């Protein structure tokens, strides 16, 4: 009951000549795959672990100033000299202070002054990098059966976890009773970890863009330092004051942790405390059903009473789940299940948990089906004690069409060109659409990188207005389309 | 004048990209008939087309445990390095960033 009730669940239907289908797995989503004569399976990317990180840079968020010293030079006599100014561990600045007989100098005028203080780091945020070949994606594959899922969450016989790494392009999962499943996932194109940094500040971590991380205006260490005392730009974390031009002072600016939390607004939080593992991103996989057979097809059928132990529950995805218990003999058998009209002339809806069987006859079976819009009747068992449970599905096929179109648009806005690989068979139209999407997305991401959703909306409005007031009818249509897409992306961004 | 290795290769050093557009991979051989040709191809996901050329022409295994590092020029898209034969074949994914 995990892929049922995630609310980010996609039904990929059918395979291609070859028995393979293309699915993109996201961390917060689920993929349930249905093919004719094939068992329904639930796919879930549940972990992405980055191994063997290398620190790219170390930033200073909280510093302290000690050993402050100053030196002065009388006017016209050049610059003051501080011995500390030879130690890069000291932050220094030069200024001018008016001098004279009163200030202990000789001639009158602006005498140079240099103040120095030992910069020390109290708290730092470490940015780490990983090679794409050191990523490990954990994918759970559970056969969509009514079997009791597991003794507990810790160890589940029902679910089969496979680890996907760039080292092997093929991963096999032995689903007991169903054959084997072949996952051929592309870990090199889900996230580009050559442009990404793993930034941990203080028991919190984020997945940030590498250039953004290197453009941060904070003091930093090279990451190969090992000494931790030679910071590159310490002036960003101190302020020198000469208010009246008669005294130079230096103070430390204060902890930059809240400022860094503000700066991290658009990043995705990850876990780096133990293991350096994160839960964001997708994984394009080619699922091969060549060696997936149904389970318990040699069982005959159940000739006995079925009782509903949990009332029919409507799922977030237009599907109903029925929990039934078997009371008859011949314990391992196939549950007679169908969704028909009132007169039972026609089959109206399809079963999601294909080939349902009762194994022990004491353990109930959660059957999931997709009933039709309107009135349907779930017929369970044979006529001697046959169950007939009415159901009404509140919706329409046009509403489902609109919702699916919106879901696909959102997926395209999230996965970009990878959206064409989702549930895709190796069709010509899908390939050409993906090529066009790649080109258009390259142009769009060149034109809109580093802008906020409000800027996106303003630009979309401007472009759509320009298209509306365009002499060319083709230019008008093209500009209006670009503006509408830009407005949609601005609305659907920052998530 | 050698026959294909018909054995199991293992990648002892992951695929490393050079600054010339090619890739170099270090593979050991655990099989019989030590001086044999290495079955190296760079194909697509379905293994229906040959996409790249290995610029280490005719890689061979002189000794069983001695590692050999092949250099190949994959295509600019997504490509797969196939090393070995059906039993224990290695399929290595790779992506080239240029155009």
């Amino acid at each position, epitope marked *: 009951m995990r892929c049922i009730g995630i609310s980010n669940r996609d039904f990929v239907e059918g395979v291609s000549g070859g028995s393979w289908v293309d699915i993109v797995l996201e961390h917060g989503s689920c993929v349930t795959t249905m093919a004719k004569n094939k068992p329904t399976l639930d796919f879930e990317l549940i972990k992405t672990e980055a191994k*063997h990180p290398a620190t790219l840079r170390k930033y200073c968020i909280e510093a302290k100033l000690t050993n402050t010293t100053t030196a002065s030079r009388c006017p016209t006599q050049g610059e003051p000299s501080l011995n500390e100014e030879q130690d890069k561990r000291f932050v220094c600045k030069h200024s001018m202070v008016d001098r004279g007989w009163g200030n202990g100098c000789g001639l009158f005028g602006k005498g140079g002054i240099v103040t120095c203080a030992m910069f020390t780091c109290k708290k730092n945020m470490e940015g780490k990098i990983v090679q794409p070949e050191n990523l490990e994606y954990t994918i759970v594959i559970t056969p969509h059966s009514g079997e009791e899922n597991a003794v507990g969450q810790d160890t589940g016989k029902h679910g089969k976890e496979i680890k996907v790494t760039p080292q092997s392009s093929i991963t096999e999962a032995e689903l007991t009773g169903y054959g084997t499943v072949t996952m051929e996932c592309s870990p090199r194109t889900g996230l580009d970890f050559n442009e990404m940094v793993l930034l941990q500040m203080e028991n919190k971590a984020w997945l940030v863009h590498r250039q953004w991380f290197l453009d941060l205006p904070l003091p930093w260490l090279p990451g*190969a330092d*090992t000494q931790g005392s030679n910071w590159i730009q310490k002036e960003t974390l101190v302020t020198f004051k000469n208010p009246h031009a008669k005294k130079q002072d230096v103070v430390v600016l204060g902890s930059q942790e809240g400022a860094m939390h503000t700066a991290l607004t658009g990043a995705t939080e990850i876990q780096m405390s133990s293991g350096n593992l994160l839960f964001t991103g997708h994984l394009k996989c080619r699922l091969r059903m060549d060696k997936l057979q149904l389970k318990g097809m040699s069982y005959s059928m159940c000739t006995g009473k079925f009782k509903v132990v949990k009332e029919i529950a409507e799922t977030q995805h237009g599907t109903i789940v029925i929990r039934v218990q078997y009371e008859g003999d011949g314990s391992p058998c196939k549950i007679p299940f169908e969704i028909m009209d009132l007169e039972k002339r026609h089959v109206l809806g399809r079963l999601i948990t294909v080939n349902p069987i009762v194994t022990e006859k004491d353990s109930p079976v959660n059957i999931e089906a997709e009933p039709p819009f309107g009135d349907s009747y779930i017929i369970i068992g044979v006529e001697p004690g046959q169950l007939k449970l009415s159901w009404f599905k509140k919706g329409s096929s046009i509403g489902q069409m609109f919702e699916t179109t919106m879901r696909g648009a959102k997926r395209m806005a999230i996965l970009g060109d990878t959206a064409w690989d989702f549930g895709s068979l190796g069709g010509v139209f899908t390939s050409i659409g993906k090529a066009l999407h790649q080109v258009f997305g390259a142009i769009y991401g060149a034109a809109f990188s580093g802008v906020s959703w409000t800027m996106k909306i303003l630009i979309g409005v401007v472009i759509t207005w320009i298209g509306m007031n365009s002499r060319s009818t083709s230019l008008s249509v093209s500009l209006v389309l670009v503006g509408v897409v830009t407005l949609y992306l601005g609305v659907m961004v920052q998530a | 004048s050698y026959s294909m290795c018909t054995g199991k290769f*293992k990648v*002892v*050093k992951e695929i490393a990209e050079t600054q010339h557009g090619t890739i170099v991979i*270090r593979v*050991q051989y*655990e099989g019989d008939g030590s001086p044999c040709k290495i079955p190296f191809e760079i194909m697509d996901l379905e293994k229906r087309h040959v996409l790249g050329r290995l610029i280490t022409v005719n890689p061979i295994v002189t*000794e069983k*445990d*001695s*590692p050999v590092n092949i250099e190949a020029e994959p295509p600019f898209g997504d490509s797969y390095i196939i090393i070995g034969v059906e039993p224990g074949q290695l399929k290595l994914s790779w992506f080239k960033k240029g155009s």
Partner: antibody
Amino acid sequence: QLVESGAEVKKPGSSVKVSCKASGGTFNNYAISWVRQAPGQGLEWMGGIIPIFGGANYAQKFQGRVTITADRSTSTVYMELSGLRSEDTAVYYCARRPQSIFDWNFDLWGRGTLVTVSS
Amino acid sequence: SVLTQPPSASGTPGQRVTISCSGSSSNVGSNYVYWYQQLPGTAPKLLIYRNNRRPSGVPDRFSGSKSGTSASLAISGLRSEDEADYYCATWDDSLSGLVFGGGTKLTVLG
């Protein structure tokens, strides 16, 4: 062609620097690694460095405790150990190896400097 | 983890003796294996480099063996000279450092 520093007797909690002077050919063509062998114990690898390149790498056990550096002007390699303690007592060796990332064949060795942590 | 090696080795002069060093998929069987002879009060000497290739210094009687995930050093003829501590050093990809074995002290009877 590889000459190490003389014997050094130290005290607990201190830091010790060991000198390994290589020739010109070994400085510009080979790497140098630091292996310390504790009294009545097996060899242990501390770290190494390509003197011409100078980027030093250390065993995970010695992160933040061993510093290895080269003096290209005098053609010398130094190992500095911080937090000297009772278990840090051992003989220390500098060995000459190629700078490839696959071959660690030490065809040259020094003579070992006995860093005796005692009185 | 580290290359497990036999602490105790015993042989007799004129007899061929070999030492076994077993590592992991990242210690041995994925990287060259080097064998070193370390007599008391002397620095270790490189016995066999690469995967059991004799440097010119070591006599032909010395030799080594390498397998899928373990290595071995072969001694053609035996003497009291082979009474020393033996170490198998190999780069570990996971450990990211040259990890020797536990050290084998070979004892020669006589």
